[model samples]
Target: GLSDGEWQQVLNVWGKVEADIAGHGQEVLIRLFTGHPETLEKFDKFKHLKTEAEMKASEDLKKHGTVVLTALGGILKKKGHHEAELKPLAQSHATKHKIPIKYLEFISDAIIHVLHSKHPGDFGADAQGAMTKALELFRNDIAAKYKELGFQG
Candidate 1:
């Protein structure tokens, strides 16, 4: 769904904001859990954060967000070659955390939303579409690995 030029658009936008990648990830996760609070139930630590205030101030959330976003950044760095990198993380989400694919998909949504808000001018329709496709491809690749592991949730 993305041409080389479109991929460069994503890379460029990310490059300008990469220094704050952790913050971006945290913001996205904040939006995700805020929009769908029940998603917190999946986290052993995050579940204890019952209120929005608590969730907002959670270092645990920040830590997890950083890890997740860092992995995403890695995938972005490799652009054309990503599935192999995505596989183990997907498997961990499946077996270790039993993170539903739906939640993983929500990460994609959060990413696009954050990107749009942060870089409104650069993150136009084409960039959004390209990132959407990239995220979906990452999601699908991970989901496939999850299924292959025969770990039914």
Candidate 2:
């Protein structure tokens, strides 16, 4: 559970870009792709994108970015009250895509970097820790499911 202040910070920072959810989400995902180019291999649709421009121009990228924002936004809003909601994503990635834990960790790292850079005024050590903790908590929640599907480490 998060404190009122932590939740307020999340709401405020997320609210800032909610108006342009697609843009914000795309930026973060793009950052992730840029930071960890190998991660793009998981997205067959986006894997062919060789450059940032290509990713930005991809309709699939835009669509998936929206999904990422929606998923992350939903989880943060729930404040750990309904973590089960994230299991479906983990399950899909595990069973179908066979995504590794490090990939999931990278996404969270990329997201935290995005939030910190974009919302410098609102994002602080405490806020960053809260967001990191949330992602790790959910990651741990889905670890068993991922392991069951033969995805470990």
Candidate 3:
């Protein structure tokens, strides 16, 4: 769906990325295709979610899984997988998933409407909650499977 210049770039970059991923076999594809990004921030309602995701991932962590780490980095700024001046154990998943940093930037701010609703700490926390719910709805079945499989201790 590219036109001339747009098409060339799309063909060169997009096609290349797909080819590269395909070259690695289907295991990577299943992970990427089935994976849903996680939320790191906490709210009264969704705090359970963030905490659960955090605990589970931390226990079953692949170390190279950047989705959850990036989410946590967005929250605590611990730079979980993005630590500067380091050898870089894992790459950031943001680029691979085409998810913008703005996703994290807007997360906490967006949830405020439903959660804190002019209640102070309302905006950011709820925004983060919204992000959690969005990710939850996106991969509920798979995440539930992860839970049923006992990723968390």
lDDT of 3 by residue, 52-105 (tens): 335344422332233443333242222122234111211222222333334433
- For residues 36-148, write the lDDT of model 2, one tens digit per residue: 88888877888789989888898778788898888878877887775478778888888788678888888888888877677777777776776777778777777867876
Off by over 4 Å in 3: 1-91, 111-153
- Each prediction's number of clashing residue pairs: 0, 0, 10
How many Å off is the CA of 20 in candidate 2?
2.1
Cα lDDT of all candidates, in order? 0.78, 0.79, 0.31
Off by over 4 Å in 1: none
Positional deviation of residue 99's Cα in model 3 after best superposition, in angstroms? 1.0
List per-candidate RMSD values in Å: 1.8, 2.0, 17.5
Give me the displacement of residue 112 in model 3, in angstroms: 4.1
lDDT of candidate model 1 versus the reference: 0.78
Backbone clashes (count) for model 2: 0
Residue 139, model 3: lDDT of 34
34-82, model 1: which lDDT tens digit per residue?
Answer: 8777677778778788777887688878888888888888888788588
